[PDB]
Amino acid sequence: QEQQYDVHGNVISAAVYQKFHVYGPEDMVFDGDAGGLTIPGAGAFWGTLFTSDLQRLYKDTVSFQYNALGTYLNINFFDSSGGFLGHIQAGAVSAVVGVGGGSGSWHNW
């Protein structure tokens, strides 16, 4: 069974880059950058982090992919080999559609 944790965060998007910020358990925060094409905008989201190994998620995440599906947001986390480390399911205040991803990592705050 994967462990479940409350998370919350924000996405801010320019036209060609975006930043994702997620507050997780154990006083850790995820910052990720994605580039490509988006509609400029921003919003908050709240949800659940699912992972079978939180320590490994925080140590080994170097990448994220996301799927924005209206007021649903899915964020998947990966290590440098493309291995899946866990994911977030969240509700987003601001409806957005798109898929993308990029570099990111977890750190203390």
**DSSP per residue over 21-86, as a string?**
EEEETTTEEEEEEEES---SEEEEEEEEEEES-HHHHHHH--EEEEEEEEEEEEEEEE-TTS-EEE
Residue 85 CB-density burial (10 A; 0-12 exposed, 13-18 middle, 19+ buried): buried
Residue 74 and residue 29: Cα distance in Å, rounded?
17
Q: How far apart are CA 53 and CA 85, in angstroms?
A: 8
| Expt. technique | X-ray
Q: Where are the chain's structural domains?
A: 1-109
